[PDB]
Amino acid sequence: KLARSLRSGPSDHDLKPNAATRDQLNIIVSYPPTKQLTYEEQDLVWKFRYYLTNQEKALTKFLKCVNWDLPQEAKQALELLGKWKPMDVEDSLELLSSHYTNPTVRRYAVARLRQADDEDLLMYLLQLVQALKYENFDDIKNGLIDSSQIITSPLPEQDLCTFLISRACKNSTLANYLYWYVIVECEDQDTQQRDPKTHEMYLNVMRRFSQALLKGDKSVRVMRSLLAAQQTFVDRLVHLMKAVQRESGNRKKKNERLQALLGDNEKMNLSDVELIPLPLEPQVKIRGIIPETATLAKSANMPAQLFFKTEDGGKYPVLFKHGDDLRQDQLILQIISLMDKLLRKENLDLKLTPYKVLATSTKHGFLQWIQGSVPVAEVLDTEGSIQNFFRKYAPSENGPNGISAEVMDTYVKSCAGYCVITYILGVGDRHLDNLLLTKTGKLFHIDFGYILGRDPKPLPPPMKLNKEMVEGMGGTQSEQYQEFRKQCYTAFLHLRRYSNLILNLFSLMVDANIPDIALEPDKTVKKVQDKFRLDLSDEEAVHYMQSLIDESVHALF
Ligand SMILES: C[C@H](CN1CCOCC1)Oc1ccc2c(c1)Cc1cccc(-c3cc(=O)cc(N4CCOCC4)o3)c1S2
């Protein structure tokens, strides 16, 4: 009941803990970021605050122990904040969560992020746009309406908002994602209905972003008109989808309405435009859609498969979905993209396919089409087995089961990567139509409708493996199966080392209207944390991951 600062003031700047207390502190400081500290642990961290200033990891624990309402305590806390060994860029993300409200703490977080490369920011931007919900809305407003018409209707100590707009003005890729991430937050009907002040803050972000662009030099002013061109392109694509959906008849009559409307550029302006960034991948500039190859994909939703002509004379296939919230897929593909990058940083390239996903609204968006990919179901239906498929398309005399050594190496690696990633992310509703293969050996998952332990069945296997994948490698007695097990436990150990970053990213998503998070927001981070088995040592994690694989594979046969 007596304030921590009253039970220990600045007089004991010289406290050093004994051997036992150091071991207790090292355990508290190593906790996952959203594990609740007991009052006793918070007292212990407060007590040895001056000692803990030498541990950058300890600062996030320390700031959660402060009574920010007690002026003298906040004063002492902010003095220590200044003295603290500066935390890592990755680790600052935690201070932009809902659990920190102190403006000096939130400004210190942004000052740490400022040290990051644009490559890193892009990897965290989906979550930094969520983090705006925890900023000071009044300060956002003081920086200075249909959100989709802001960018198209030009008039004739940083906080998070100021920082994101400043970095976006210098980097066209960052600008592109910032634009589309904020548009989707503005179009969110639940935010509009349940949280009008939050909707208003996101409108204010977009109006500030527009004004910063209109104030910039020639290059920066052109960025605005390129965002405007993408916005009006997507608006036309949506108009076109509504027309094709409003057509009575069958896939063939619908496909002719699609090709006809794409074919009329004076009407729709979709087949022949000045180079615009592809919203899905803005590094790729597009000349327009090829009308005569456009068709509806064979599914219930009937997304348009569209081929974009690129500035370098390539074709970039996408799906455009209308009447579908892509945000859950967008988050999972962004996290797989991050996991893939962390594995490559540690020199493990597991030949993953983090294909691009962008919501252009809560109701429509793009997915990258991986050209030459086929569902495993189709590989089975046509060639009987994965090994038959690989023998037909990548044969090798002196190679495993007569298959190219490079293709089998790619297959083993990608099977391992996806078995560990789909296990960590608790991906459900796995079957041979949402498992895809390429002729280069790449296996990958699509359609992330069930995540974080959800499944159509109540007790799904924790490891998402099937008989056909293992027979693909040449069964349980092959060198390839051994190499698969080794790559699984290696990948698991590497991702555990980034558990602080991955759990902080999910922490920043608990207020996003992503269905499988919205179900149980307060339980979301813990469901990811448990999969890392952070109660186990590295050696025990290896044995645990081998049990999971052995038990899953034993049951399959
Ligand atoms: C059997 C065909 C043969 N091809 C067709 C195209 O011309 C060349 C011959 O091949 C496929 C390949 C993949 C898929 C389908 C069919 C069905 C399908 C139908 C509707 C939607 C999806 C779907 C949903 C999704 O969420 C993410 C993704 N992909 C992302 C990764 O790249 C592949 C597509 O696809 C998919 S998945």
| Contact 432 CB / ligand 1 (< 6 Å) | no
Closest CA to 444 of 548, 340, 343: 340
Can you tell me the distance from the alpha carbon of 554 to that of 487, in angstroms, rounded to the nearest whole number?
Answer: 19
Distance, CA of 351 to CA of 335 (rounded, Å): 16
Q: Is 377 in the pocket of ligand 1 (CB under 6 A)?
A: no
Task: Decide: 447 in ligand 1 pocket, CB within 6 A.
Answer: yes
367 lines ligand 1 (CB under 6 A): yes
Q: Cα separation of 241 and 427, whole Å? A: 30
Long-range contacts: 242-251, Cβ < 8 Å, 24+? 242/322, 244/296, 244/304, 245/302, 245/322, 245/323, 251/295, 251/296, 251/298, 251/302
Contact between 416 and 441 under an 8 Å Cβ cutoff? The reply is no
Residues with Cβ within 8 Å of 196's Cβ and at least 6 positions away in sequence, in order, are none
Whole-angstrom distance, CA of residue 28 vs CA of residue 59: 12
Q: At 321, phi and psi to the nearest 5?
A: -100, 135
Report the candidate in 286, 282, 335, 284 with the shortest Cα–Cα distance to residue 171: 282
Strand order in the sheet with 435-437: 374-375, 435-437, 443-445
Question: To 5 degrees, how large is the angle CA 294–CA 298–CA 300?
Answer: 120
- CA 455/CA 461 separation, integer angstroms: 10
CB 94 within 8 A of CB 510: no
Query: What's the gap in Å between 235 CA and the centre of ligand 1?
Result: 24
What is the distance between the alpha carbons of residues 292 and 51, in angstroms, rounded to a whole number? 69
Q: Using most ligand atoms within 8 A of CB, pick from 319, 328, 382, 445 the residue to mutate for ligand 1.
A: 319
Task: Tell me the torsion sign for CA atoms 530, 535, 537, 539.
Answer: negative
The 3-state secondary structure of 346-384 reads: CCCCCCCCCCCEEECCCCEEEEECCCCCEEHHHHHHHHC
The tally of CA atoms less than 13 A away on the side-chain side of residue 299 is 14
| Header resolution in angstroms | 2.1
Which helix (H) or strand (E) covers residue 359, if one does? Answer: strand 357-359
The dihedrals phi and psi of 374, each to the nearest 5 degrees, come to -140, 145
What does the alpha-carbon distance between residue 297 and residue 303 come to, in Å, rounded to a whole number?
Answer: 6
Angle at which helix 172-187 crosses helix 160-170, to 10 degrees, equals 130
Q: Which of 296, 299, 306 to mutate to test the pocket of ligand 1 (most atoms within 8 A of CB)?
A: 299
Compute the distance from residue 157 Cα to the ligand 1 centre, in Å. 47
Contact 364, 429 (CB under 8 A): no
Q: Indicate the burial class of 474 (C-beta count within 10 angstroms; 0-12, 13-18, 19 or more).
A: middle
Stretch (H or E) spanning 483: helix 479-496
For ligand 1, the distance from its centroid to the CA atom of residue 37, given in whole angstroms, is 47
What spacing in Å lies between the alpha carbon of 421 and ligand 1's midpoint?
21
Q: Cα(97)–Cα(63) distance, rounded to whole angstroms?
A: 13
Phi, psi of 367 (to 5 degrees): -125, 135
**Experiment type:** X-ray
Rounded Cα–Cα distance for residues 225 and 242 (Å): 26
Terminal Cα-to-Cα distance of the chain (whole angstroms)? 60
Question: Which amino acid appears at position 87 of this protein?
Answer: M
CA of 406 to the centre of ligand 1 (A): 24
Residue carrying the six token digits 């149980």: 520
Q: Which two tokens stand for residue 463?
A: 């490891």
> Tokens at residue 139, please?
């300060």
User: Are 353 and 418 spatial neighbours (Cβ–Cβ below 8 Å)?
Assistant: no
Distance of alpha carbon 461 from alpha carbon 401, whole angstroms: 30
CA 11 to chain CA mean position, Å: 46
* Amino acid at position 218, single letter: K
Token readout for 504 is: 């902080």
